[PDB]
Amino acid sequence: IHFINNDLLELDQNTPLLELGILDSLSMVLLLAHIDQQYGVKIPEHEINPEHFENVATLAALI
Amino acid sequence: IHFINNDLLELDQNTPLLELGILDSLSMVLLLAHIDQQYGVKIPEHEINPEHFENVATLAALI
Amino acid sequence: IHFINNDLLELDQNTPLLELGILDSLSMVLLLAHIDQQYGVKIPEHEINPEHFENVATLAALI
Amino acid sequence: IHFINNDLLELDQNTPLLELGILDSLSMVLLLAHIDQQYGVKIPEHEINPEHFENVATLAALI
Amino acid sequence: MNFEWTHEQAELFEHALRFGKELGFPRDNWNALGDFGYFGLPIPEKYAKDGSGFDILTTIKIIEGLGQSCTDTGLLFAGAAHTFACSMPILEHGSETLKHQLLPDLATKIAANAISEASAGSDISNLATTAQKEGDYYVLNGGKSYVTNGSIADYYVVYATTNKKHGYLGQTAFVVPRNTPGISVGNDYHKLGLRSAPLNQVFFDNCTIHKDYALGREGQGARIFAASMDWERCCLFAIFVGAMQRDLNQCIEYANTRMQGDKTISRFQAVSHRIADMGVRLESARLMLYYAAWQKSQDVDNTKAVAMSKLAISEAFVQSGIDSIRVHGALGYLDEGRVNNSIKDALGSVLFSGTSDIQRELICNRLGLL
Amino acid sequence: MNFEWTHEQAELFEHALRFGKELGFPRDNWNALGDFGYFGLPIPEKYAKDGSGFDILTTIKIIEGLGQSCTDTGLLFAGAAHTFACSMPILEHGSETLKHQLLPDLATKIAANAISEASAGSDISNLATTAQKEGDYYVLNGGKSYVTNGSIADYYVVYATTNKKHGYLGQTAFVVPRNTPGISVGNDYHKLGLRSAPLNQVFFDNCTIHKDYALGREGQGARIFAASMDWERCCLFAIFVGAMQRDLNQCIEYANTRMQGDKTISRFQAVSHRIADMGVRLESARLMLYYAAWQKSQDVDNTKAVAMSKLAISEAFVQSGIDSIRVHGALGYLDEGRVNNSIKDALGSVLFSGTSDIQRELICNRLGLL
Amino acid sequence: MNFEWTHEQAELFEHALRFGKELGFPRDNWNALGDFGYFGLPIPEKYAKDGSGFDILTTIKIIEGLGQSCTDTGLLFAGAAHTFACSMPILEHGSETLKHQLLPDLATKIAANAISEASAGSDISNLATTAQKEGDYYVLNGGKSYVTNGSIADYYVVYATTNKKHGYLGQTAFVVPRNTPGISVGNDYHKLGLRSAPLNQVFFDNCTIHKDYALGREGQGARIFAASMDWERCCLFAIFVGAMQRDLNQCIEYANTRMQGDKTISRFQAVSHRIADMGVRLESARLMLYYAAWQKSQDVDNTKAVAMSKLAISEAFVQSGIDSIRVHGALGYLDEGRVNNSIKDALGSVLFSGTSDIQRELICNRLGLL
Amino acid sequence: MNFEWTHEQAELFEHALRFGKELGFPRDNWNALGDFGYFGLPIPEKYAKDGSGFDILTTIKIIEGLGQSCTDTGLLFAGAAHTFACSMPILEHGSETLKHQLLPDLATKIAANAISEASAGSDISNLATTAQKEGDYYVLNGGKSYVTNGSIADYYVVYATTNKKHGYLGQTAFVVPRNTPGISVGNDYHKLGLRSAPLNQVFFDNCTIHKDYALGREGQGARIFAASMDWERCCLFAIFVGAMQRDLNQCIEYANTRMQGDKTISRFQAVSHRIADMGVRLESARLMLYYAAWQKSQDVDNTKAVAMSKLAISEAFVQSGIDSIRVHGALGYLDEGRVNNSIKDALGSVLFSGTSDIQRELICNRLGLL
Ligand SMILES: Cc1cc2nc3c(=O)[nH]c(=O)nc-3n(C[C@H](O)[C@H](O)[C@H](O)COP(=O)(O)OP(=O)(O)OC[C@H]3O[C@@H](n4cnc5c(N)ncnc54)[C@H](O)[C@@H]3O)c2cc1C
Ligand SMILES: Cc1cc2nc3c(=O)[nH]c(=O)nc-3n(C[C@H](O)[C@H](O)[C@H](O)COP(=O)(O)OP(=O)(O)OC[C@H]3O[C@@H](n4cnc5c(N)ncnc54)[C@H](O)[C@@H]3O)c2cc1C
Ligand SMILES: Cc1cc2nc3c(=O)[nH]c(=O)nc-3n(C[C@H](O)[C@H](O)[C@H](O)COP(=O)(O)OP(=O)(O)OC[C@H]3O[C@@H](n4cnc5c(N)ncnc54)[C@H](O)[C@@H]3O)c2cc1C
Ligand SMILES: Cc1cc2nc3c(=O)[nH]c(=O)nc-3n(C[C@H](O)[C@H](O)[C@H](O)COP(=O)(O)OP(=O)(O)OC[C@H]3O[C@@H](n4cnc5c(N)ncnc54)[C@H](O)[C@@H]3O)c2cc1C
Numbered sequence A, B, C, D: 001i002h003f004i005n006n007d008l009l010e011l012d013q014n015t016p017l018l019e020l021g022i023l024d025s026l027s028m029v030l031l032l033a034h035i036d037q038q039y040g041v042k043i044p045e046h047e048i049n050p051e052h053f054e055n056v057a058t059l060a061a062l063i
Numbered sequence E, F, G, H: 001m002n003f004e005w006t007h008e009q010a011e012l013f014e015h016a017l018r019f020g021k022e023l024g025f026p027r028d029n030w031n032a033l034g035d036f037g038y039f040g041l042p043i044p045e046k047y048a049k050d051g052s053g054f055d056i057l058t059t060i061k062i063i064e065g066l067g068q069s070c071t072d073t074g075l076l077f078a079g080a081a082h083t084f085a086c087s088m089p090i091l092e093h094g095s096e097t098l099k100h101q102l103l104p105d106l107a108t109k110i111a112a113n114a115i116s117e118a119s120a121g122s123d124i125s126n127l128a129t130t131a132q133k134e135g136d137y138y139v140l141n142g143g144k145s146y147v148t149n150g151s152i153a154d155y156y157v158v159y160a161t162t163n164k165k166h167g168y169l170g171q172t173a174f175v176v177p178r179n180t181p182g183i184s185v186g187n188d189y190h191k192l193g194l195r196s197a198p199l200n201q202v203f204f205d206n207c208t209i210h211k212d213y214a215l216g217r218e219g220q221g222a223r224i225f226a227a228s229m230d231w232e233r234c235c236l237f238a239i240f241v242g243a244m245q246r247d248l249n250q251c252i253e254y255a256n257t258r259m260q261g262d263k264t265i266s267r268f269q270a271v272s273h274r275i276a277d278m279g280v281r282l283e284s285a286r287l288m289l290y291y292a293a294w295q296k297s298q299d300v301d302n303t304k305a306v307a308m309s310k311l312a313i314s315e316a317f318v319q320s321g322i323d324s325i326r327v328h329g330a331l332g333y334l335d336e337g338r339v340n341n342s343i344k345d346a347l348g349s350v351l352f353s354g355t356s357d358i359q360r361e362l363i364c365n366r367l368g369l370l
């Protein structure tokens, strides 16, 4: 996931995605799309939350 | 049918509609529409011809 | 002056230009322009009047 | 000169303005304008150079 | 792929068209709309005995018919904020008890959506309105700056920051009853158009509301908001397609009657081709409206079609209102002309539910643009 | 070929800019404009001790400065109808006694131009208002439908048919005093913009006026009208160039201050490039304004440049008023925003002095198009 | 009212998309299109063993897919003139023997539609091409000035005046075989775009053709022409919706890859919002295309929807071609860029099948404007 | 403030108008332009016996006259790159010996401006072309991707990075003679328009050039470039104002001659009002051109007026080329029509000297937008 660095930002597993603004309303759409093509996972609505999207490590966990 | 004089021209029953250009492609649409609202008649395709549309008198005949 | 027939109308010397609407505000400009190129005359303001512009004959007179 | 931080960036006297891209073609215009209103100085062309615009300290020097 | 409405849909549509002429705040017309079924259109019978449980297409088609026949566009706009920015997030994310509590009167009591602030408009990422939890209650603090239906609201759907560290996910949506102490409301703003839809500042000064008034899980607010904007941007703007058809109808009728030089002005192509372009943009906007409502019933991402529709419709409405005045001349500039209300309302429509600039940002996003 | 104003012109311009903040019908502001010299700008000292005898460029440049600094655009519009549709045809085609009679108060009494009728707007070729001569007097009959300054007018410049057979040359221009029996005036029309410029229906019911009130020879009226429209279309629209500069200034100031996401909105190219296009259209419109005023002082046909300027300026003003609101968001839609008056006034400006369609007809004509 | 394609339609659509990369006059690609079924799409099996008998929606959807995947737009344009301006009037107004004679090779031999003359373009009311009947034969005389497929045509659908006194009804449509003596053809015109669709002058010098080659009754030609333009304006322009999608796809891909200042250019709103507007106009144009094809299958007057679609699509195509170049910079101006063909072809598309001005005349008419 | 040209300027202007019809790479026409004085217009006699030493207004007015009368716009464009992107930076920042060396042949040898790279177009802040100093010489390395006059150039004005750490100030401008070993040039690019102005890739492979070929102090290059773009964006686009006047003249002449229905097409307002708007944009663009050239002679910041002029002119040129084709119908789409060259050249003009997007960035900047 250098995707977040190139596609969304143009960083490591502990950079706080929500706290510093990297995932917002638009970037989330790009991320959820990348998560569907690369890993085949379609993250259900219930599990979009600050636990899982705290950072890349927690995010990768849920994937 | 002072409709032809006001709506289409802004004339009598012997003025030649086709020969002098009063009924063309656009005016025909307005006329066929007026013939459907005022007299309830929907002139079929086969009978659009220079006999019936020679003038108002011949036209009224077909209506 | 078949100019009036082609350029302005797309008639004779007794057709009433003002009474029937042939010379208005716009057509006058085209006419005054033609009168300057063809006959070299630049009709002064005072002489634009219904006497001289009654028809082609009266108009030609003033030219 | 928190002007550079608010107006141009939305940093200290040793941050390298040219090396890190803070002064370019557009920001220079805004800066030269601010230097004319606040300090009355109109920096001549010859003295726009990397010595004087290395950073805020060198820049303030030339002012 | 077909463009045919069912017999039942055509009948509801002509029922909306016929209802238009049966019509401070016009409370009587608002109640008459309730009786017609306007606030009940997308509500299921499970939650209101006068709910219609219609699908999105039947909904918007009826709304389109109301926009065509009701001259008070502002009133339709007020009712649609209430239904689609408030009733729907309640239907879709409220507890079962809150749904049975709130919806029967909502489908028929008035609701207002409150997210905008002094420093948050196009960007709703950093809301200054806070909600601290205390025991079984939340304590709300902050001002909301442009609340449609503010002065007439019985409930506010408020979006507040519950956790600044979770950012985009640090926001919760609440239903704040009017009558919760600490609420004060400013006078209706004087504005360019839409006089029948009140617009107010609302301040919340230590409003204590029970846990059960929160919409969905804490931290869900930003996505609950996006989901209500998907309803408002799709369905509310059906009004403006209806209003454009009336506009076009009045320009056709006027251009065929008004004469300049014992010729009707429709014989000038500056007029008639202007009216042609009104009809092209209208058919474009109507079709994009229908397409967006269909996709919304289909379980795909429909945000791109919805942003496109809101854009196309609202921008066409602005052009429609300018052109309507141009066609009517001085008559359209005069108030009795009954024509200059379109431009006045249309300029609102390119702002609320997110400006035209913000819709394009959404469109770009859904197209893949980084 | 240069774009330099003289020292004296720059000084008059900054004097107009400074005058703006010293400001039913605002009679006090109107008198203050008279004292400043606004109605006297193109009048020679020969006919008014407070006439300025300025050339067209100095005139329009001062008017441009008033349009920039005075928020009441409607008031400037009223004063400019009075000066350029009425005072100028009096200066240019009135008898010497009528000039000494009427002008000293006009340069300082109020005048209104009346040609439009129920069935004559864009086409003024067949006026239903008649003037039959009887002895030393003319008897006027007919209604005028949109008279700016109607309710406040002391004099009307009326255009009537004296000879239906002479067509384009069968019309005479009169100065009808208010206080001529038979004049009745309707209440000020409620209209979209320009509240400070009254707009009225005026009826003339057997108004008997002395031969000496006629402007120029009988039958000259249509060309006297065209000559006054050359003044109104050239000089009145200087107001709107001034107003666009204020509009642009407020959008620059707002976009550099308003923040969304701890960035100022000018950092979005949807905003900033929109403001760029406001400045391009403004500079275009200002330059076409200056060019038209210069040609008017030059003894050539200047109608094409004047029609172009009125078109460019009025259409830019409409775009300016939409964009100003777009830039300011909800704030610009609110009345306190102090922004939505531009679009409201600008939509008038594409109608009076002849609609945008009619200016293009003139342009086409002067280009040679048959 | 739904926007769902059947399983079979989606499959034909992806079959058209896959076919694109299997591709003087490119006769080989033209034959490959015949094998794919392109000229057979709307032809019934009754008249060609390789006719598909598809409805209008399945037809245009396949054509849209070919326009997206085939870079030679001119070739698709040639094939669509042949099928919709020639094959269809033959199917709809030819004798049963002429249909069995001509159609099997047409569905698979090449046809060209010829009506335009030196003095007849937008106005086809007074055609200088005459057809005098003699016994069992007609004798054709006159030049046709812009015949697509002229040089490659085996048959011409010619429209000639048979009776100047019957005006709009004094015109007959003929199928003139190439190989009829008296036909001469000019060299392919050098033109801005569409190199693969030949455009020729054709002269007819005493061409004697048997009665049985006439299409429909004598005097029916003008309405047979209008009926073929209803096919060409509806179905041919499906190509350009396909081409716009490719255009948009290439601008999205380019804007997400091309960098200026270690940022991709899509991060500039001047670029991205430009691409957003490409997608809005495309979805608008596609929807108006679908709507027009559906109405055509419905037995109502569909001329207004067809004129609207041709207008919207062709004008969007012009804007698409400009914007595509703007997005790509110098790369899009260069031929290897593979981008500037859109604007070159699109400018044709606002002319043939009747200019944008003429479509609006139709739209005005169908709206009721006098 | 006046718009009067001196007797001498009018005479030079009609001399340019008369010169137009006296006209691979058209070397003969290029030499004829040299004899007329085209490359010598802004050069002082001090540096060329055939230099004219004209001021900017006389310069651009003559260029405007050449653009009106010479059909080969590409050739004028080539000559203007040579004079304003190359000769002027040499005049303004070259040593006295380099000026006497280079300018006499330049005013009469061909020069090409080279800054664009594979990854540098709109952003010229990080150039990959390097110049390392060694003793009394500089060693140049890197490719330039779009060099007008590349294949015919005797000298290249090259902009290279001399010091990556000084950023915007780490760039130097050089005059690289053709015949400096290590230069290779690609074949002329096939492009949409402007065939007579070659466009080439140039590679510099260890080009060693003497210190005395550098323009100005090391590190000055980016501002030397901005100063040459102030010349190119101001004066080169005078060509396109001249070409638009020819375009407009041909549309007036055509619309007054071409008939459809025994009426000339100018009687349709769709045509005539389209031509009116061509004249409005032209007068706007011409006036903004003149205004920018005057300010440039005045010692103020003139970048805003120059960016505005380039924008207005280039965008008008695109619209002019579309409209010219629309007016002429199929005739304008055909090459013999002699009309479709405008759109082909105009689309270049919104790219080079910086795209329309980049001009607005400049305009925004000079307006004060952060
Ligand atoms: C009639 C009306 C009723 C309303 N009702 C309600 C209501 O009931 N509830 C409610 O919460 N709000 C309501 N609003 C406000 C509405 O939601 C708007 O979103 C708000 O007015 C827009 O933000 P703003 O006014 O602060 O403008 P800003 O967000 O400050 O925008 C100013 C300008 O900057 C532009 N801009 C901002 N961000 C970007 C960006 N990222 N890219 C490009 N351009 C950008 C905008 O498009 C605009 O041109 C209403 C507004 C109106 C006019
Ligand atoms: C604020 C305001 C103040 C005014 N003040 C005055 C005043 O003091 N005195 C006065 O006499 N009048 C005044 N008027 C009226 C003014 O002179 C306008 O010309 C008049 O309103 C325009 O004509 P109309 O309204 O009858 O519209 P119409 O002439 O009926 O025009 C209706 C539509 O048809 C179009 N049209 C008409 N003819 C043509 C044509 N030949 N070609 C193409 N399109 C055409 C118009 O452009 C317009 O789109 C004022 C109007 C306004 C809005
Ligand atoms: C690529 C291409 C292929 C073609 N292929 C064929 C073919 O196979 N067969 C064929 O018969 N023709 C063909 N044509 C011609 C085509 O049918 C066009 O209709 C014709 O070119 C348009 O008429 P015109 O060129 O004579 O222009 P004109 O009709 O002279 O029009 C010139 C201008 O006047 C305008 N104008 C004309 N009448 C009106 C009106 N009433 N109201 C407003 N504006 C009006 C036009 O819109 C245009 O702006 C083709 C043209 C092109 C470009
Ligand atoms: C006919 C022709 C002749 C030329 N001759 C020369 C020559 O002699 N010498 C030379 O050096 N070059 C020349 N060029 C190139 C020219 O200088 C252009 O600037 C270059 O083509 C533009 O950059 P680009 O093509 O790399 O596009 P890019 O810079 O990649 O731009 C692509 C798109 O992104 C947009 N964009 C880029 N940056 C921004 C931004 N900050 N904000 C908003 N939008 C942005 C652009 O406007 C465009 O829409 C020529 C080009 C042409 C077409």
Ligand SMILES: CC(C)(COP(=O)(O)O)[C@@H](O)C(=O)NCCC(=O)NCCS
Pocket (backbone or CB within 6 Å): A024, A025, A026, E115, E116, E121, E122, E123, E124, E222, E223, E225, E226, E229, E352, E353, E354, E355, E358, E361, E362
């Ligand atoms: C960034 C974003 C587009 C959020 O989009 P998202 O929640 O879909 O991810 C956001 O800034 C937005 O939608 N703003 C619109 C403001 C608005 O719609 N206010 C409506 C109350 S009338």
Ligand SMILES: CC(C)(COP(=O)(O)O)[C@@H](O)C(=O)NCCC(=O)NCCS
Pocket (backbone or CB within 6 Å): B024, B025, B026, G115, G116, G121, G122, G123, G124, G222, G223, G225, G226, G229, G352, G353, G354, G355, G358, G361, G362
């Ligand atoms: C007046 C009219 C609109 C005829 O319309 P109609 O036959 O539907 O009544 C006519 O002038 C027309 O359609 N011209 C278009 C010319 C054209 O389409 N040529 C196509 C061959 S490419």
Ligand SMILES: CC(C)(COP(=O)(O)O)[C@@H](O)C(=O)NCCC(=O)NCCS
Pocket (backbone or CB within 6 Å): C024, C025, C026, F115, F116, F121, F122, F123, F124, F222, F223, F225, F226, F229, F352, F353, F354, F355, F358, F361, F362
């Ligand atoms: C035909 C024409 C253009 C007359 O032009 P002309 O007198 O210059 O010849 C005329 O119809 C016209 O100017 N109408 C404009 C109406 C108008 O300007 N009313 C102004 C009072 S606000």
Ligand SMILES: CC(C)(COP(=O)(O)O)[C@@H](O)C(=O)NCCC(=O)NCCS
Pocket (backbone or CB within 6 Å): D024, D025, D026, H115, H116, H121, H122, H123, H124, H222, H223, H225, H226, H229, H352, H353, H354, H355, H358, H361, H362
């Ligand atoms: C940022 C900036 C605007 C530089 O502006 P500046 O040097 O005036 O400060 C720059 O990116 C620019 O001007 N790019 C334009 C590219 C160009 O003009 N190429 C011309 C060779 S044809």
